[PDB]
Amino acid sequence: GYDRALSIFSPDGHIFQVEYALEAVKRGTCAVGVKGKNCVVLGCERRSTLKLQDTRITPSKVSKIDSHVVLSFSGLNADSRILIEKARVEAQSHRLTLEDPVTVEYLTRYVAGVQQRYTQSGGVRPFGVSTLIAGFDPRDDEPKLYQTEPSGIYSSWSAQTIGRNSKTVREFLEKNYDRKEPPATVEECVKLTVRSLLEVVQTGAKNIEITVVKPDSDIVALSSEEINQYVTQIEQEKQE
Amino acid sequence: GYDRHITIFSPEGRLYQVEYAFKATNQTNINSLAVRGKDCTVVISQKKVPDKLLDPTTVSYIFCISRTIGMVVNGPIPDARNAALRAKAEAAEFRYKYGYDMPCDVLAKRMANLSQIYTQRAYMRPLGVILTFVSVDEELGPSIYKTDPAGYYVGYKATATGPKQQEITTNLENHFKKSKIDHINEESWEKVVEFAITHMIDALGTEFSKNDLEVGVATKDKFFTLSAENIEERLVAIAEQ
């Protein structure tokens, strides 16, 4: 087996392979998550350097880890599949031994743990992936949104964004999200999510994806149809 | 230019480490020669004991591999002994597995295949030696098969190895172009040894005492090396010209 230490310290006290893994995330298509008062919404930019795509069969950018937790990501698509697979296996393993589905914090801590392990293991590079992990703990209606990054650090967010032009939309949400007043309705939270993407996303076309997770394993994704109805509506609210 | 340090190709499709291993071959500054009789194969190598503190009997580049196979080495002694021990192990194992004595040309191929591996795998360095195997094979008669660091091997009518190899080769080439046969047309191994030492003296243009030579003889069912006295006897007969 290949032994080489690829993630090592530099004289300034930085681990360049981790920091370069973040550069891969920076380049990744934008992803955003927003806590409602009793929902979480995951929004995802999808680049339009290519049409003639088949979107029935192309990997969707939000993945179910269990029936009550979802995971979106920014960065290397191939790398994300490995993290998703491990997380889905760990979720079934947790159910099998603890006789309870994972808490979002636990599933996050697991994925974060995998990401970290690759930052101090021989013969592996870190994951070029940051993740948003969103859902509801079992028999709990308080929503959960966590972020992980190639270093393996993870934390909870009222709302957060990752990938290209995420500094733009983090500035938007910082400005447009009251913690004292979270988006009370589903529609309200979905709206704020689309709005933040429209700072960055070009057109409303098949450029945006929204997935909405409600409590008790109530996960459904919106079709262009129903997102267009927000894109149409927010456009006609710019008339000041 | 790290393609010069390990056995990977240079841009002109060359393995420099294999080429440099050939240069180590001549580092001992010894010349060896091998010819075939009707009944025998004779190997002769120069014996140089520079230091007086050396026990001259322990200084040898000829090895008795098996009952039937003898091997002479052109190259440094540590690589020579490494190669010898291996061929001894390989010839013993072959006998145990397949129920008959390992032929000269098969051991040569086997040792050449081992040499080939060092030219392809990076962590193994080639051995800086050329291995001249001699026997009287039970199927093929008197045999000379020779191996180099490149993993190349071929059978020889006769052969020479060392710095002065080219002079010894053309000398032997000329004898065979003339005599017009595969071998030294001689009855006794004693007279094929005499032939070998003679054509070594002519090609090198130098004279040998009994301690300047090392001789090995392969016959049917035993390969043996001559003592100082068996050579001295043989040198004395060469005097009658």
Binding site: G1, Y2, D3, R4 | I6, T7, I8, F9, S10, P11, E12, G13, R14, D105, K109, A112, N113, S115, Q116, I117, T119, Q120, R121, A122, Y123, Y145, A150, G151, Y152, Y153, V154, G155, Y156, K157, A158, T159, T169, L172, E173, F176
Partner: protein, 250 residues
């Protein structure tokens, strides 16, 4: 701590070249010319036996090798690499085919195995590619006669006729002129001897030329009778004499 080389010694350069495969092909280019021709009722592979010394007995060093009773191989490039590849090619024909199906592998299947061994030297840790290109000529009941070329990359292509090594460019032009899809084997042997004269500088006779056919079955070469469905090997190396016989009507 012996083998630390568990990483590829063949990697992609910024231009997308695989340096060590290109260099292995360069090593083949320097190699002595070898060629193969498909006739309608046989295949011929041939090469020059360039001697290192006149004291070398060049019948001992065989460049054309039997792989199965119906498959032969020849090469240009590094002889030692060819030797160990023939050994692995013969064994893989048994371990991963004959020991399973009780019959020898068809030409393209055995070629596929040889190619696979050469591809692994192109990717596996701590090894250089093989410095040879093989021409593998063989017959199998359900494909008839065929000829394949295997390169250091592990790529293989089927040929009507081709050559490799030194004077391949020259010879490939010669073969194009003279090849038709109605050649009887004897005609292809003759053409192969003409094509090989061009590239051979020194002596050109039965002792400096190695030539084998994949032709008719040879009961005389089988070694036993009593089984009516074992008719013997289609691979036959032409003798020193048999080559010189044809160099008359040249």
């Amino acid at each position: 701590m012996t083998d630390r080389y568990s990483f590829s010694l063949t990697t992609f350069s910024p231009s997308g070249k695989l340096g060590q495969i290109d260099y292995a092909l360069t090593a083949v280019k320097q190699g002595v010319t070898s060629l193969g021709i498909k006739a309608t009722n046989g295949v011929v592979i041939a090469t020059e036996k360039k001697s290192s010394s006149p004291l070398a007995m060049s019948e001992t060093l065989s460049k054309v090798s039997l792989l199965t009773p119906d498959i032969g191989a020849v090469y240009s490039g590094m002889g030692p690499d060819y030797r160990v590849l023939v050994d692995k090619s013969r064994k893989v024909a048994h371990t991963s085919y004959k020991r399973i199906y009780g019959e020898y592998p068809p030409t393209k299947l055995l070629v596929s195995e040889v190619a696979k061994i050469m591809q692994e030297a192109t990717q596996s840790g701590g090894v250089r590619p093989f410095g040879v290109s093989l021409l593998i000529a063989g017959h199998d009941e359900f494909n008839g006669f065929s000829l394949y070329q295997v390169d250091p990359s592990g790529s293989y292509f089927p040929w009507k006729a081709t050559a490799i090594g030194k004077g391949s460019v020259a010879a490939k032009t010669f073969l194009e002129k003279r090849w038709n899809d109605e050649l009887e084997l004897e005609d292809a042997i003759h053409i192969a001897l003409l094509t090989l004269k061009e590239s051979v500088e020194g002596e050109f006779n039965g002792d400096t030329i190695e030539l084998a056919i994949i032709g008719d079955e040879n009961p005389d070469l089988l070694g036993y009778t009593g089984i009516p469905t074992d008719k013997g090997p289609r691979f036959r190396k032409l003798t020193s004499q048999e080559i010189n016989d044809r160099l008359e009507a040249l």
